[PDB]
Each structure stands twice: as structure tokens, then as C-alpha cells.
Nucleic acid binder design. Structure first.
Ligand SMILES: [Zn+2]
Lengths: 117, 86, 639, 186
DNA sequence: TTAGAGAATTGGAGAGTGTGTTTTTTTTTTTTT
DNA sequence: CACACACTCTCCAATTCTCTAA
């Protein structure tokens, strides 16, 4: 199944979907942090695989069960894992554009093997 | 300030059991074969009484606290008094 | 650090797949052992050598490619035993402060790395070959040179099997080869499993019985006996279809819950306003309740719609089960089934006799009877599973084992109540004892079912002995009257309830079949006055505590709970004991369950007791006050 | 051996990494325990305090303000830095000597009462002789004191003395023996 | 066997400290005028 | 400047542990 840009409503959040669109602008490829490795500064314990939200996130607790630290952490950039990241604007293709409408644009995120394709 | 407690002497025998004696004077149970809705009505009335007594807690937390309070002098003396006359 | 680096460099280097040892390996290894012996209490040399990964980079290649060089091989084995020493032995305990706990976690991390490295079949092949050519000699031909080498080899295997799974990589999904599964596969392919069977069955080498028992315990650490015994050729199709069906069941449950939530909230956005006065409901003041959370919520109104739950304080936080169960790799499960079968048929009686001799002679470590009781539970359960043959476990069926388990269980119970600083550990030891006791009580039932009149005779003998002696009857009440959710897990509560159900089943059937009146200087007995001891508030409180998880309980567990409560209510007329407000909240959940049809027994019992309560309530309105507290003999005053 | 003082532990990565510390200490006790020597630091947050190794690994000391004005030791180590923002000089000097000896290595309850108390009326609670000796702040109100008593006069460290709404007719000359009194209300 | 009086530990109220903010014109240059 | 947020620390008292009597 294929969906229109007009059909990307909130009901489709989190569902696998296929759309057609015309690329309008592609931004530079960046490295995006996918999982941070952190050092606890007041007990020297290393917390691995801290998964990232849509905000840059530190450990919620220290991995050491008796350590009371919850904000003093240092990212180790060399031991963390990054992914290639690129955002592109698209709009509705000429065929799918409803009559009289302004073209509806969408933001698409490309990752890893798919960037700059 | 007077931070309140669900304890044996502030409210459990003042706004608690004396009012709980009266809560079900006007209840509307219908007996055998309708135990589900009878229990729903009972739970709603008990929950409402508990809320008006100590509004800080949820109903099951209130229950787990009052079951512990069942061991205290004032509570069991009031329980026996309510069993006997008034 | 740098001096250790120098010696570690002096060990040699790997090239492609061949290790080129330096001629000064012997003195460098002795220096490494000296540093480890002169460690700080923080175990700095342990941490540094683990960080350098010399166990993975030097010692395993040396062990696997220069095993003919006997002095170097012996030195490497001793060094590897020292390095693989478990962290609980390294530090004595789990540290209570951050710095030592960080060091503990470091040593544990490097131990997990060693366990990852040790899955190579070549290492265990060398270990099996050297142990085999050693044990080829007669016992009288051995000296300290070879006996100490057997000790160090078996301790190396024990150390590598003992290591806890990494919290990071314990997220493996079922039917996948964990590090422990790969290690067991390495043992299988190396053939050290057959050497362990030989050591267990040997009368001459009985001196290693405790060691071999610990190896077998750590091997079968993760498994369940009935689940393991069910393994066979046709399991792939069964498990595939089961996985698909369970996936669909989970999906349907989630869809149902989503629809119920979608109905509970309205079809208007949350900032769509509107307020109501519920005229009958007085607020916390005298004014009528003003409701703001939408008309949809007033169908199932409750005052706790917007309340934050409470922080359970640290002391009152319930105990949680220490591990999830995962279905290990099918190859490893088949191998463990075959190991367990051959061990049960060829080894088990002699090994258990030897371990009992060691415990009697008191040449065992402090808690080795826990391994003994584990072996009782696991292998008797496996025996009853599949082809039950009591001859394979006849060393365990004596009344002396009942007495030993009862003594250990009472000892652990006392030590749990007194030694409060490791009460959870004493509870776990008591849980092992309880499971062993449960398996004995199940085995006598299987002996009754079995056709042999001889085993039926001995089953009658042991049943007469156990039901005559008082402690076997009183221990269940002793456990119920001081069980604590704060300390003991719900798995323990499940096992206690099921064991109590089985025990009362056997005792009731025994007394129903024949009188056998004298019990305990003897006195009369009857099962009804025994059951009246279970009319206490604490035991039924524990039973409803287990009943709260009826959604997650097994069907057999739910049957045990409801059958006991039905026995207390219908047959002993103690419904007023179970007339309680918390129990009524649980019944409210049971009646409101969308899957209530799946719990037909529980809802029928709930409706029976609810009907009795509302009859009493119509007769007398003070029953509503009586619901609020647990009781003693108000159970009769209400009546 | 033990030392009572405010403590602030600063991990030395923070400044070069661009992160700023709290800027003040926390009331604590330091213990020089020892088979091998440890430093235990315990605060309100942790009765079971944090250990620190010092057998061979003190970096250096700072001593410019050991007279206990704007003071510290600023004891640096691999990697932490320990600051002691307020103590008493003699005991701190003895503690530093013991620390130096432990680092050379070859040889060898924070209870408190608040500033403040209040009596809203004598019949609810009389002052009695149960006051803290070094109390800093007290209110007495609606009490029938015709004249101020030795009970409040003998307090060694009062900043605030309030007798408002009491019934004092005369006040003494010995109320002026309060060295640090900054607030007097009648 | 229950529970109540004295001592110790934990929850959280609140006192104290630090941070962040409120279309227009003249000139160039390329292409198009 | 100055008026709201955001964060930490301390003290106070309420709950639970331990030992005793009803
Ligand atoms: Zn930490």
C-alpha cells in the first residue's frame, strides 16, 4: 500500500508507511548520537548504551547501584556510537497534488545507508 | 501547619467509623444473582467515605494503612462499642 | 601498571593463529602470581590484568598450544584459577559503599569477559584430554602433584561456570545461545561432560563428589526439570506454532485494552471544556462535587482518577524475583536432557550417597547442603517427568532425607528471622529446601500411582512415618505465620501454597482411606481440627496476596488458591474471616475482568462469598464496618 | 583522629570540561580508618560514607588559610579534590598530619540543633532549663513574664531575642551580656 | 500471642541560592532592460 | 536593577525497628 502526503495523519504515527514525493532540498550529512557511553564523574563507573530521545540524554541513574549521582556524567565521544543522519524536505508530486491547493511539504529523515541517496 | 495523618486518633473514630455506621443506612442492594453490581455500589460508597476522611491517599493505600490501624487501642475499642450499642 | 605491562609483554605474542612463547614465560608467570598474591584489597592487579586481557590474549593460547610444557601448563592453570576467582570471594561480600562496589563491578566485568572468551572448544578439549590422561592412572598411583592438578582443573571449570551473566547482554531473547549456552556447548563438544559423569559414577574417585555436584549445579543453573524433560525431536514445529499463537494472544489483549481506554476517554479533545455538579456526592467539604474530567469518566467515576500513588518506603518495598526465565538454545536443551537422563541412570545414587557422607563427616563447606537439596529437587522432578522409575532415586526416598530437609528448612527459617542482615539469602536457601520437600511429597504420590506393590508398600511406610511425626505437619503453619512479602518473593509464596495444597491432599486422602488415629507419648488426631489451624488471619492474608496476581498465576496455582479458600469457606464455615475490604477490591477486579470467563472457578467462588456477605449485610448493617479490619473470633461474633 | 567539618568533593575533570561546581560545602565527618589506610567521608546523604584510597596517592595540600577564615585544605588526588570549608584549626592540623603520615604509608555523628525555637505561650511549653546552650534565636509570646529571666539571658550565642506580647514591666541590665545579639523585640 | 512504649531512620516541607528576560534604507551588482 | 522559575540543602517530625508487658 501507498499513502498520500495528505494522509499522513496522527493515526499513522509509528506505523510502517510508504509515500511518494519530490525532493525539494537536502541538508548536510551529520553524525547523530544513537547511543552514548558515559563516565560517572564521582565514582568512575562507565555506563554504556544510553539510548537517545529527541533530546540529548545522559544516564538517569548511575550503573553502580549504591552511587547517588544523577546529573554529573561525561560523554566519551570515542567509545559512543553514531549514525549518519540527513534531513530532506519533500513535497507532493505533481500527479498527487489536489487541484487548487498549495503544495504540502514534509520533512524526511534519512539514516545510515540511505543518506545522500 | 498541622500535617495530617491517617492515624488512630485524628479522624478514624471522628469522621471515620461513626459516619461509616451511617453511610449504608440508605443503600440499595438487591441480593442474590446481582453480586457484581452490589459489590460495585459497595466499593463506590466505601471509596467515597475513605476519600472524604483522608483525601491524600488512593483507596487501596488507604485500605492497607487502615488494616494496620486495626491493631490500635482506640480503633478496636470503638469497634466493640459500635458492635454493642453506639 | 608499567611493570605488569612489561611482564605481560614478556609472555609472548600471537601471530595469525600460532602463539610464540618467550623462554622466560615461567618466571614472568610466577611474577604475575606474586603480584596477584600481593594485591591490594581493591584487587588492583586483578583489574589491571583483566583490562590488559592477558587471559584472552596469552594464557588461553599458551594453554591450548603449549600444553606439553608441563611446568608452564601447571603455572598457567594456577594463574587462571586465581584470575577467574569469583568476585564474591575476591571481596568477601557485596560492598555497601560506592568505591569498593565500583571495583567489584570492574572485576565482575572482566570475569564476564573471561566467560565470553572461554567458549572456545579447544580450551575445554585440552582440559578434558589432560584430565582424562590423568584419571587414566589408578588412585593409588596419584600423588599431590596430580591430586592438586585435578583440584585446580575442576576449580577452573567451576569458576568459569559460576560467573553471573552480564546485565548488558542478559537481554538475549529465548531460543538463542547465551554465553552460558555456548559454554555448555563447549563442554559438550569437548567431552568433559562424559568425564563429569565418570567422576560422579566412580567409587574410587568419590573424593571429588562435592566438586562434581557444584559443576552439575552450575551447569543446570537456568533450567526447569519438567520443561527440560519435555524436550525431544519434534519440538521445532511445536515451539514455532506456539510462538505465533502467543503473539496473536498478546496482540488481541493489547487491542482490547486500547479499545477500553478509547471508550473511557471521550471522542473530544482534552481542552474541550465543560463542568458538572454531581448533586448527591458531597465533596471533602459540605458542597456538592464539581467534576471537570469529562462526562465520559462519570460512568466509572472514582475519587482516585487524578491522584498520584504513594512512594512505598524502602523498608516496605516488596521483594522481586531475581531473574526472568528464557528458553535456552535447543541444541543445549537437548544436550542437557541427555546429560540429565544419563546422569540420573548411571550417577545419581552414588553421588547423593557420597555427598550425604561428606555432610555427615563434616568435610564440606558451610552451605553445601543447598547443593544437595537443589540436586534432590531437580533430578527427582526430572525422574517423575517422562519415564518415572523410583530405583533411579531410591537413595533419596528414605525418611532420613525428609528429616534432613525439615531440619535444614527450620534452621533457615530461624536464621532468616534472626540474622536479619542477610534475611533474603536465608530465604533463598529456605526456598531450595522447600522445593526439595515438595518434590519428595510429589514423588510419594507418583509411587502410589505406579503399579509396583513394593513401591506402594514403601510409600505407605514413609507416609505413615511423616504424617505421624509432628514437625512435618506444623512446619506449614510455622512458615505461613511468619512469611513476609518484604523479604520472600512471590515465587516462594507460590511454591509454599502449592506444597501446602499437595500435603493436605495427601493427608486428607490418607485419613479418608483409613483411620490411623494416633499421632506424635501419642495423642489422637483428626484432619478437621488440623485444618482449623489454617483458620488464622495471617494464612488467608498470604493466600489472597498470592491471589492478587491471578492474571499472571498458573492455572494450577489458581486452583490451589481457590480450593484452599473453598475448603475454609464451604467446609469450615469461615466466610467471615474472608469478608474483607481489600479482598472485596480484588473480587471487584475479578468481576470486572474482560477475561473473567477464563477464571470461572475464581469468579464463582467470589460470587458465592459475596452473596453470603450481602445476606449477612441485609440482616445486619454492622458487617460494613466489619469489612474494614482483619479479625480473630469476630468470625463467630458476626455469626 | 576524626574531624567534623563541611566538605566539598570536586572531580577535577569539571573545570577543563567547562562544568562549574556547587560552590559551598556540606556538613560532614572525616575518618582516617585502617589493614591499609582509608579516608571515610560521611554526610547527611550517606551515613555509610565514601572511602578514598590514600596509601600512595595524595597529589598535594593547600595550607594558606588553615587559620579557618575563608579556608580549606583543597586536597588533590587522582582524580578528586577534597575541600574542607570550615573546621577548627588545631584539630584540622592534627588531621592533616595524620593524612601526611598515611600517604607516606610506611608507618600506620554530625548531630546539631537549629538556630531557632518558638514559645507561642508558656502554658503550651515553658522554657525551663532544656534550651540548647548555644541557641541563636528564640521567640516567646503571650507569656506572663514580668521581667526577663536568666533562662534566656544565659544563652551564649543569641542573634534574636523576641518577647513580643509578653507582660514585661522592666528589663534587666544583664540582657546586655549577649555578645552577638542583633535583634531585640518587646 | 498481641500490641504498646522508647530509640533510630527516612520522607518531605520549606528555607535559601542562582539564572534570564524588553518591515526599511542606501548601496552594490548582474541580468534585463 | 526585579520578578518569576529552577535547584540544592537542611531540619523537623512521622513511620518503622527493637524490647517489654498485658
Ligand atoms: Zn556513579
Amino acid at each position: 500500500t501507498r499513502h498520500k502526503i495528505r494522509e499522513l495523519t496522527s493515526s499513522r504515527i509509528g506505523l510502517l508507511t510508504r509515500i511518494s514525493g519530490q525532493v525539494v532540498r537536502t541538508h548536510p550529512v551529520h553524525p547523530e548520537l544513537v547511543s552514548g557511553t558515559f563516565l560517572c564523574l564521582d565514582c568512575q563507573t562507565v555506563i554504556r548504551d544510553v539510548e537517545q530521545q529527541f533530546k540529548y540524554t545522559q544516564p538517569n541513574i548511575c550503573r553502580n547501584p549504591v552511587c547517588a549521582n544523577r546529573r554529573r556524567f561525561l560523554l566519551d565521544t570515542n567509545k559512543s556510537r553514531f549514525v549518519d543522519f540527513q534531513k530532506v524536505r519533500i513535497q507532493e508530486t505533481q500527479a498527487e497534488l489536489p487541484r487548487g491547493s498549495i503544495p504540502r511539504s514534509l520533512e524526511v529523515i534519512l539514516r545510515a545507508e540511505a543518506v545522500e541517496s | 501547619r498541622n500535617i495530617p495523618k491517617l492515624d488512630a486518633q485524628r479522624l478514624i473514630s471522628e469522621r471515620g467509623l461513626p459516619a461509616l455506621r451511617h453511610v449504608f443506612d440508605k443503600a440499595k442492594f438487591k441480593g442474590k444473582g446481582h453480586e457484581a453490581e452490589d459489590l460495585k455500589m459497595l466499593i463506590r460508597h466505601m471509596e467515597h467515605w475513605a476519600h472524604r476522611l483522608f483525601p491524600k491517599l488512593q483507596f487501596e493505600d488507604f485500605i492497607d494503612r487502615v488494616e494496620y490501624l486495626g491493631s490500635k487501642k482506640e480503633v478496636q475499642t470503638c469497634l466493640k462499642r459500635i458492635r454493642l450499642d453506639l | 601498571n608499567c611493570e605488569l605491562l612489561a611482564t605481560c609483554s614478556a609472555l609472548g605474542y600471537l601471530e595469525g593463529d600460532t602463539y610464540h612463547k618467550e623462554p622466560d614465560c615461567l618466571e614472568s608467570v610466577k611474577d604475575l602470581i606474586r603480584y596477584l598474591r600481593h594485591e591490594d584489597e581493591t584487587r588492583d592487579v586483578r583489574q589491571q590484568l583483566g583490562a590488559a586481557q592477558i587471559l584472552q590474549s596469552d594464557l588461553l593460547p599458551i594453554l591450548t598450544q603449549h600444553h606439553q610444557d608441563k611446568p608452564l601448563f601447571d603455572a598457567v592453570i594456577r594463574l587462571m584459577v586465581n584470575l577467574t576467582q569469583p568476585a564474591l570471594l575476591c571481596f568477601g561480600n557485596l560492598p555497601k559503599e560506592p568505591s569498593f562496589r565500583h571495583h567489584f563491578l570492574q572485576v565482575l566485568t572482566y570475569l564476564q569477559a573471561y566467560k565470553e572468551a572461554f567458549a572456545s572448544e579447544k580450551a575445554f578439549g585440552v582440559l578434558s584430554e589432560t584430565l582424562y590422561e590423568l584419571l587414566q592412572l589408578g588412585w593409588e598411583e596419584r600423588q599431590e602433584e596430580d591430586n592438586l592438578l585435578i583440584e585446580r582443573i575442576l576449580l577452573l571449570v567451576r569458576n568459569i561456570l559460576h560467573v553471573p551473566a552480564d546485565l548488558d547482554q542478559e537481554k538475549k531473547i529465548d531460543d538463542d545461545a547465551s554465553a552460558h549456552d555456548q559454554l555448555l556447548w563447549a563442554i559438550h563438544l569437548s567431552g568433559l561432560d562424559d568425564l563429569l559423569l565418570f567422576l560422579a559414577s566412580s567409587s574410587a574417585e568419590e573424593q571429588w563428589s562435592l566438586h562434581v555436584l557444584e559443576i552439575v549445579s552450575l551447569m543446570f543453573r537456568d533450567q526447569n526439570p519438567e520443561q527440560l524433560a519435555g524436550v525431544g525431536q519434534g519440538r521445532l514445529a511445536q515451539e514455532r506454532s506456539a510462538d505465533f499463537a502467543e503473539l496473536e494472544v498478546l496482540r488481541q489483549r493489547e487491542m482490547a485494552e486500547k479499545k477500553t481506554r478509547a471508550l473511557q476517554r471521550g471522542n473530544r479533545h482534552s481542552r474541550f471544556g465543560g463542568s458538572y455538579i454531581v448533586q448527591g456526592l458531597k465533596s471533602i467539604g459540605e458542597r456538592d462535587l464539581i467534576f471537570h474530567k469529562g462526562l465520559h469518566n462519570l460512568r466509572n467515576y472514582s475519587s482516585d482518577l487524578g491522584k498520584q500513588p504513594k512512594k512505598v518506603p524502602k523498608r516496605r518495598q516488596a521483594a522481586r524475583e531475581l531473574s526472568i526465565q528464557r528458553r535456552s538454545a535447543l541444541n543445549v536443551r537437548l544436550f542437557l536432557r541427555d546429560f540429565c537422563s544419563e546422569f540420573l541412570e548411571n550417577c545419581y545414587n552414588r553421588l547423593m550417597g557420597s555427598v550425604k557422607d561428606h555432610l555427615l563427616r563434616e568435610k564440606a563447606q558451610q552451605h553445601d547442603e543447598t547443593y544437595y537439596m537443589w540436586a534432590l529437587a531437580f533430578f527427582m522432578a526430572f525422574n517423575r517427568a517422562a519415564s518415572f522409575r523410583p530405583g533411579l532415586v531410591s537413595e533419596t526416598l528414605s525418611v532420613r532425607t525428609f528429616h534432613f530437609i525439615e531440619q535444614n528448612l527450620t534452621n533457615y527459617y530461624e536464621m532468616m528471622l534472626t540474622d536479619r542482615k542477610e534475611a533474603a539469602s536465608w530465604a533463598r536457601r529456605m526456598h531450595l529446601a522447600l522445593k526439595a520437600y515438595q518434590e519428595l511429597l510429589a514423588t510419594v504420590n507418583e509411587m502410589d500411582i505406579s503399579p509396583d506393590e513394593a513401591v506402594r508398600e514403601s510409600s505407605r511406610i514413609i507416609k505413615n512415618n511423616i504424617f505421624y511425626v509432628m514437625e512435618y505437619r506444623e512446619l506449614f503453619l510455622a512458615l505461613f505465620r511468619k512469611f513476609d512479602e518484604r523479604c520472600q518473593p512471590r515465587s516462594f509464596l507460590r511454591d509454599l501454597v502449592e506444597t501446602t495444597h499437595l500435603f493436605l491432599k495427601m493427608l486428607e486422602r490418607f485419613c479418608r482411606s483409613r483411620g490411623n488415629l494416633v499421632v506424635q507419648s501419642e495423642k489422637e488426631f483428626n484432619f478437621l481440627d488440623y485444618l482449623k489451624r489454617f483458620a488464622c488471619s495471617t494464612v488467608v492474608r498470604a493466600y489472597v496476596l498470592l491471589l492478587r496476581s491471578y492474571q499472571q498465576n498458573s492455572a494450577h496455582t489458581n486452583h490451589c488458591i481457590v480450593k484452599m479458600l473453598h475448603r475454609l469457606a464451604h467446609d469450615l464455615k469461615m466466610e467471615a474471616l474472608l469478608f474483607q475490604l481489600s479482598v472485596f477490591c480484588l473480587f471487584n477486579r475479578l468481576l470486572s475482568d474482560p477475561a473473567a470467563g477464563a477464571y470461572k472457578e475464581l469468579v464463582t467462588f467470589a460470587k458465592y462469598i459475596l452473596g453470603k456477605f450481602f445476606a449477612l449485610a441485609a440482616v445486619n448493617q454492622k458487617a460494613f464496618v466489619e469489612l474494614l479490619f482483619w479479625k480473630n473470633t469476630a468470625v463467630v461474633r458476626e455469626m | 583522629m576524626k574531624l567534623h567539618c563541611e566538605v566539598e568533593v570536586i572531580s577535577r575533570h569539571l573545570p577543563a570540561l567547562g562544568l562549574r561546581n556547587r560552590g559551598k560545602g556540606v556538613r560532614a565527618v572525616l575518618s582516617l580508618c585502617q589493614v591499609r589506610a582509608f579516608l571515610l567521608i560521611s554526610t547527611l546523604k550517606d551515613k555509610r560514607g565514601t572511602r578514598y584510597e590514600l596509601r600512595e596517592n595524595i597529589e598535594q595540600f593547600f595550607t594558606k588559610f588553615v587559620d579557618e577564615g575563608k579556608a580549606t585544605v583543597r586536597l588533590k588526588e587522582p582524580p578528586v579534590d577534597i575541600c574542607l570549608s570550615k573546621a577548627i584549626s588545631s584539630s584540622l592540623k592534627g588531621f592533616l598530619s595524620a593524612m601526611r603520615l598515611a600517604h607516606r604509608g610506611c608507618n600506620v555523628e554530625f548531630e546539631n540543633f537549629k538556630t531557632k525555637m518558638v514559645i507561642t505561650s508558656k502554658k503550651d511549653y515553658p522554657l525551663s532549663k532544656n534550651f540548647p546552650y548555644s541557641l541563636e534565636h528564640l521567640q516567646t509570646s503571650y507569656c506572663g513574664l514580668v521581667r526577663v529571666d536568666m533562662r534566656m539571658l544565659c544563652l551564649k550565642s543569641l542573634r534574636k531575642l523576641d518577647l513580643s506580647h509578653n507582660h514585661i514591666k522592666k528589663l534587666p541590665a544583664t540582657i546586655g551580656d549577649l555578645i552577638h545579639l542583633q535583634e531585640l523585640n518587646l
